[PDB]
Amino acid sequence: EGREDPQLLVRVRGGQLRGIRLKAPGGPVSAFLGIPFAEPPVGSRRFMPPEPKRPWSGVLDATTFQNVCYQYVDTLYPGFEGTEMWNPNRELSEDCLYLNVWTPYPRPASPTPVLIWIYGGGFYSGAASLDVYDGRFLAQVEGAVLVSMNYRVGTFGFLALPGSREAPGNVGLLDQRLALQWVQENIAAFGGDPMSVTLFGESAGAASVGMHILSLPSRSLFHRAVLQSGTPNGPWATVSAGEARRRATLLARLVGCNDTELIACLRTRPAQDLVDHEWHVLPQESIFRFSFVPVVDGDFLSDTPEALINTGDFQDLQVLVGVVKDEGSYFLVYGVPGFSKDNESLISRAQFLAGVRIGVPQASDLAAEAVVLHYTDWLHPEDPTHLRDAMSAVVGDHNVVCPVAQLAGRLAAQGARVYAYIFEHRASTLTWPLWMGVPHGYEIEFIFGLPLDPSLNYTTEERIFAQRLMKYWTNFARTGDPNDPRDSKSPQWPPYTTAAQQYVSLNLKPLEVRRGLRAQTCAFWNRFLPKLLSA
Amino acid sequence: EDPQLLVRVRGGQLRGIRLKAPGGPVSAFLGIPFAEPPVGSRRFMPPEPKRPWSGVLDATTFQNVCYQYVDTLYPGFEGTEMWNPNRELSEDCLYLNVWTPYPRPASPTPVLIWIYGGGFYSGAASLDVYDGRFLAQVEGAVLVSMNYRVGTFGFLALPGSREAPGNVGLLDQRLALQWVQENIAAFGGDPMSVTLFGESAGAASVGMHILSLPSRSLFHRAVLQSGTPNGPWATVSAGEARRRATLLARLVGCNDTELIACLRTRPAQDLVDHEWHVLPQESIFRFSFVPVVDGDFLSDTPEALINTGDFQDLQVLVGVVKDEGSYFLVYGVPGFSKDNESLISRAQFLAGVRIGVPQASDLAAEAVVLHYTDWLHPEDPTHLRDAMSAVVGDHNVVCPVAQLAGRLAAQGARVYAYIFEHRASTLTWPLWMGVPHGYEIEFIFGLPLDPSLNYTTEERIFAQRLMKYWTNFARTGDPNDPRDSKSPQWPPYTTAAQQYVSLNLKPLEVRRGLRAQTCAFWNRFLPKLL
Numbered sequence A: 001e002g003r004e005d006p007q008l009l010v011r012v013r014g015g016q017l018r019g020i021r022l023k024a025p026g027g028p029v030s031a032f033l034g035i036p037f038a039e040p041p042v043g044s045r046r047f048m049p050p051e052p053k054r055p056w057s058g059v060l061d062a063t064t065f066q067n068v069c070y071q072y073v074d075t076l077y078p079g080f081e082g083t084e085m086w087n088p089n090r091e092l093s094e095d096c097l098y099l100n101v102w103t104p105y106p107r108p109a110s111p112t113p114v115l116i117w118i119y120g121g122g123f124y125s126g127a128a129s130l131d132v133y134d135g136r137f138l139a140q141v142e143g144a145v146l147v148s149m150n151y152r153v154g155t156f157g158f159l160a161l162p163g164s165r166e167a168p169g170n171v172g173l174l175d176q177r178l179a180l181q182w183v184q185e186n187i188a189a190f191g192g193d194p195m196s197v198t199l200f201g202e203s204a205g206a207a208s209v210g211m212h213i214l215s216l217p218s219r220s221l222f223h224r225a226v227l228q229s230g231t232p233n234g235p236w237a238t239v240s241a242g243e244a245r246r247r248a249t250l251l252a253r254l255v256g257c258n259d260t261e262l263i264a265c266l267r268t269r270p271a272q273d274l275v276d277h278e279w280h281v282l283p284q285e286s287i288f289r290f291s292f293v294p295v296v297d298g299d300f301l302s303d304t305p306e307a308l309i310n311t312g313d314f315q316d317l318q319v320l321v322g323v324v325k326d327e328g329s330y331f332l333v334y335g336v337p338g339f340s341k342d343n344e345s346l347i348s349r350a351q352f353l354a355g356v357r358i359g360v361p362q363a364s365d366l367a368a369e370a371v372v373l374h375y376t377d378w379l380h381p382e383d384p385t386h387l388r389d390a391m392s393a394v395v396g397d398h399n400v401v402c403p404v405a406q407l408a409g410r411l412a413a414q415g416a417r418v419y420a421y422i423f424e425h426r427a428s429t430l431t432w433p434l435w436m437g438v439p440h441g442y443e444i445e446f447i448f449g450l451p452l453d454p455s456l457n458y459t460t461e462e463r464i465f466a467q468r469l470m471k472y473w474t475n476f477a478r479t480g481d482p483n484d485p486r487d488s489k490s491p492q493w494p495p496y497t498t499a500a501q502q503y504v505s506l507n508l509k510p511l512e513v514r515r516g517l518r519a520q521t522c523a524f525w526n527r528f529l530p531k532l533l534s535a
Numbered sequence B: 001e002d003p004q005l006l007v008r009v010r011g012g013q014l015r016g017i018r019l020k021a022p023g024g025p026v027s028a029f030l031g032i033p034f035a036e037p038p039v040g041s042r043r044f045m046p047p048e049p050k051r052p053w054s055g056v057l058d059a060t061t062f063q064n065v066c067y068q069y070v071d072t073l074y075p076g077f078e079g080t081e082m083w084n085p086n087r088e089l090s091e092d093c094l095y096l097n098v099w100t101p102y103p104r105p106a107s108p109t110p111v112l113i114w115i116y117g118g119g120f121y122s123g124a125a126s127l128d129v130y131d132g133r134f135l136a137q138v139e140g141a142v143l144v145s146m147n148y149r150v151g152t153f154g155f156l157a158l159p160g161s162r163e164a165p166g167n168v169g170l171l172d173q174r175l176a177l178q179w180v181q182e183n184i185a186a187f188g189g190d191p192m193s194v195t196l197f198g199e200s201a202g203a204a205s206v207g208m209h210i211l212s213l214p215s216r217s218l219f220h221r222a223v224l225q226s227g228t229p230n231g232p233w234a235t236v237s238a239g240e241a242r243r244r245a246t247l248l249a250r251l252v253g254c255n256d257t258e259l260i261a262c263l264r265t266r267p268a269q270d271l272v273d274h275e276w277h278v279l280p281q282e283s284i285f286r287f288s289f290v291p292v293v294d295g296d297f298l299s300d301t302p303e304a305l306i307n308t309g310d311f312q313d314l315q316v317l318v319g320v321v322k323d324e325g326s327y328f329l330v331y332g333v334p335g336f337s338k339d340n341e342s343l344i345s346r347a348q349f350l351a352g353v354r355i356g357v358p359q360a361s362d363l364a365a366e367a368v369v370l371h372y373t374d375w376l377h378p379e380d381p382t383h384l385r386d387a388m389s390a391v392v393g394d395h396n397v398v399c400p401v402a403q404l405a406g407r408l409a410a411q412g413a414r415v416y417a418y419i420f421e422h423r424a425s426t427l428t429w430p431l432w433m434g435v436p437h438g439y440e441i442e443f444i445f446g447l448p449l450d451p452s453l454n455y456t457t458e459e460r461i462f463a464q465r466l467m468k469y470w471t472n473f474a475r476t477g478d479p480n481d482p483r484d485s486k487s488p489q490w491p492p493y494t495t496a497a498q499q500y501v502s503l504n505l506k507p508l509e510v511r512r513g514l515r516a517q518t519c520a521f522w523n524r525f526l527p528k529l530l
């Protein structure tokens, strides 16, 4: 040691770490980045559950983000900030199982509550190193301990031959779990309270958080949860065992391959090779045609999430859940004909019925008719501006809003304290067109407090709003309640109940309560539509 | 012998009575025979023209009501009695009435011909709410109404047979129209400006005359208030009518000719006993005998017919009231009564839907339930009560009316549409029924102008307004006052804009889309589902 900053040397179960004093707007923070939490899932270890990181010697340098798990890189709009912001930002490699910790500087006196971030990316992409997940502001301004882990995505993370020894399924979720275990054992070394661990995540990350709520071994590893624009139930977060098996076999064939023999072959294929084909498994025209997601294997998920949210005891659970104004808009540009970032995307009725088939690929002819009918404004059934917005809502409501309204519903009714929001503020800095509104993913930069960095060109009120949001989230991590125990002159955020179905709007104005989360429409998707398949 | 009350029609001479109306006298001619009494061997058969008569036939009093079920659900309650027969029941009933201004019109007056409702099982031209005195006095209109055969007497068919070919109640109506072409001039009427108006079954009948070629040269315009030829209750298929007929015959104990001869030999009241037992089927609209799609009077189902028709030179006024379905709930629908506020349980509501939409499969019931539920207050008895009313109103009246208005407009007719939202101060049903089926007629007919009836001074003006709308449409095809700038104007209903007006105490408001989303559900979705 000798000369090193003493505030930046920590020991964990695996050995010694040297961190980095990072500069934040209102003062310094500590970052320990790229701490390994598992033996690299490489070689024979591919597709297999993660093994804990065998202890190292000397002082590990933990001052940079590590490799990002091997994934498909988005190339729809080269140069485009609005898509690149999600692209991997460190080397792609299968050796990717590391996690990051941000803590106050100096590391705090008494043990602070911990927030853990599980990123999204539809289970096919993502990294804890992306800028919009920088934990420094929450660390600095809210005295929070923040942790984020890398977990395997795509085939490496989720390709499953259910029932086999060699590719059991859900290993991405199992990487996430090992990181939570690591948190329990080690977070205290950084002044973290292993008895106050809140999970938060967004899209597939929010679905992840939901599945930890539903998976017993993972239940003992956290206390509160926050699900932003995602759910474990719903059309895209899981697969039946058989389907997962079909998809893995099909991919195996595509790359040129008794389960052992099959996976053995797969394992000898180069990483990129697998990534190059993961999209071909469903020629099937479908936005959410991502083939490798969590499998209902009767192990990690003892049963479908839908089943488990209708029969679980959530007496002891505080949950924060919400959606953004325009969940679907973002998705339209990725293969719904007529939609683009570069024009107003006004579509024709023909393009609407066509987009409904693609957006809802599980839908029969009669169901597509049902959807089209429910979303048509019969005053102006030909108006392109409306149809455009309709197509957005269909995709948005089917994939996010209704699963979330359902999740809030069942959980509240089944003993949970649920708090629900809808995020309504578009970034002054947003680089997507006006027609896309407040799109899926664009709350994250606010929760994380990015507008506090003066160099980012956010308006003043955005900087105030960010602070306000960070208060809600961390208050929730702290107490199970987003409200302020002291200051109650500014309006209260009531729990969501079956009785009142109350949620609040998040935008530049003070809090506003509303009743009913797309109540009528979600009744369509959650109650009616299923039965139109018992036919 | 007042020579003004004396007219020579093709059958002979008639003497009218000088009736008194608020601001002047009118000439009535009540109970004119337009057909030979359809009695004995003539039961179930097309009407024949009435034979000429010697001397001066007394036409100063209303004639017999066609033989019908008399309603006994709420005995002595004026809400129901007002619809009940107000003269002797008798199979001998084919009589019409003409009201005209006194002295009788100097030049040819547009004629309005009324057709009563009653679901094709009840009704009379002679009811108080169809009194033609005001429309004749105040607007100088020649107003005609006729009795037509109802129930088994008017609509019992054994399709394709010679001796009960069906639709005779409609043929009665037609013959009155024929009579008006031939005779109405002699009263000062203009046979070149005949306008038909009717409510409920009367509306559907009007609509059937639109859809029947031989009727078309007998009128020029039409008004269909709260009814349509299309929709669930107004028509039956050849197959189904024949089944209902033979089942009626079996229920009274009875080869086509032999079956009818046996029916013909049966007292009228006997058929009325088993009238309501042909569809035991716990619904409301379990009335068995209605117009039948016969390849004759109706060449094809009204749906088919309104879909392909060319309605080029035709003007139509159509509309609904604020709460069509409330009325029908009190008739055989559990939880509903004129006596309590009728706040219902969710379970009641689901069974209520299986009853109100008796055509509905398990699934479509579920659809209807899920559509009409207020998902914010899923259990509130006020909403489920009001919802039940809506389901029944929409399915049977509102959506059929929306659909026809759309089709006529699409195929070149000129369409004016309304919603009637004023609840009569003198109404006798409870508040939860709002503005129920039927309760617009009294205003169109001018009843509040009669001080003895205790209608508010506001309601009396509202009447004059509606009377102007109707007669203005009768005169011109356009309900708008041709000498009223600063209106605002009543726009034609088109498929693009979808404009109707609200008829109530506040001056006209133009609204767009007549239950657009909900009727899309009824008119586009359910069909596919079945």
Ligand SMILES: *[C@@H]1O[C@H](CO)[C@@H](O)[C@H](O)[C@H]1NC(C)=O
Binding pocket: A337, A338, A339, A340, A342, A343, A344, A345, A346
């Ligand atoms: C906008 O761009 C898309 C994709 O290039 C194109 O297909 C669409 O027709 C355009 N929209 C219009 C009609 O301006």
